[PDB]
Write a protein that binds this ligand. Structure first.
Ligand SMILES: NS(=O)(=O)c1ccc(NC(=O)CN2CCN(C(c3ccccc3)c3ccccc3)CC2)cc1
Ligand SMILES: [Zn+2]
Length: 258
């Protein structure tokens, strides 16, 4: 599978029938319809500075992996009943500045969306195991818009060169993902799924209300990455996102009032 004209999202269901399930992600968030839920606890992202291991071009996105042997880098509170350890983060972006995010807000996309993937290691033995349970995963999504240069993003920006080709990876020590968070912890949350195959409906989504900003140059580096391996005909990794899926009666909650 992929994001090409033949193996793109509109055809994934042929391999993964859950692609057409009742809690697929992403979705279009209709702000006026989200339910303000003050009963939710505060969302807390307690991330340590040196838990990162590597950066990898897996052919679908560029992903930074973390050491999840313990819970020093977890997301807690909000709709979650316990701590979920950070496993990795990656991005989705477009060819043009007007698209790229997976979730949309009132029909609007951002040039990119960041995904912080966590799993319930407290009750499940492996990430793979948790990825199949309704309460197994928690992904925090952060929208990215272009504007002023993001200081910390340079660390990642300057590393993209080494992984321009599919299947390449490199050591990536001491990157604190907290540096990629906005100053607000307001969010929308709803029960969903992974946005790429196997598309398992095991994700409690937490989409931050406030986006972070990166310069057009930093955004451009992401577009310099390739879907293709070192030998293949260069095909730039762009538009690696899945369109909004049917809500199907799901309730979207908000930690704030619009
Ligand atoms: N954009 S998103 O929604 O934030 C997203 C986040 C992570 C992913 N993918 C992974 O982190 C890679 N996982 C996928 C699940 N894999 C499981 C699995 C496969 C099929 C059904 C359920 C779980 C797996 C388990 C054991 C062996 C191999 C794979 C492990 C590797 C895809 C999308
Ligand atoms: Zn993702």
């Amino acid at each position: 599978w992929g994001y090409g004209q033949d193996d793109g999202p509109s055809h994934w269901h042929k391999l993964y029938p859950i692609a057409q399930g009742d809690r697929q992600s992403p979705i279009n968030i209709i702000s006026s319809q989200a339910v303000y839920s003050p009963s939710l606890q505060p969302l807390e992202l307690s991330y340590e500075a040196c838990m990162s291991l590597s950066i990898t071009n897996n052919g679908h996105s560029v992903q930074v992996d973390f050491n999840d042997s313990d819970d020093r880098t977890v997301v807690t509170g909000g709709p979650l009943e316990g701590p979920y350890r950070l496993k990795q983060f990656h991005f989705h972006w477009g060819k043009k500045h007007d698209v790229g995010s997976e979730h949309t807000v009132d029909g609007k996309s951002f040039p990119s969306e960041l995904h912080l993937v966590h799993w319930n290691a407290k009750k499940y033995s492996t990430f793979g195991e948790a990825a199949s349970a309704p309460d197994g995963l928690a992904v925090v999504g952060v929208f990215l818009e272009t504007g002023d240069e993001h200081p910390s993003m340079n660390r990642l920006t300057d590393a993209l060169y080494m992984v321009r080709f599919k299947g390449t990876k490199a050591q990536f020590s001491c990157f604190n993902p907290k540096s990629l968070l906005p100053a607000s912890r307001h969010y929308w949350t709803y029960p969903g799924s992974l946005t790429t195959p196997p598309l398992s409906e095991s994700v409690t989504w937490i989409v931050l209300r406030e986006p972070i900003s990166i310069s057009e140059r930093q955004m451009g580096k992401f577009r310099s990455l390739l879907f293709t391996s070192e030998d293949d005909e260069r095909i730039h990794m762009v538009n690696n996102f899945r369109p909004p899926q049917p809500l199907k009666g799901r309730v979207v909650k908000a930690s704030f009032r619009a």
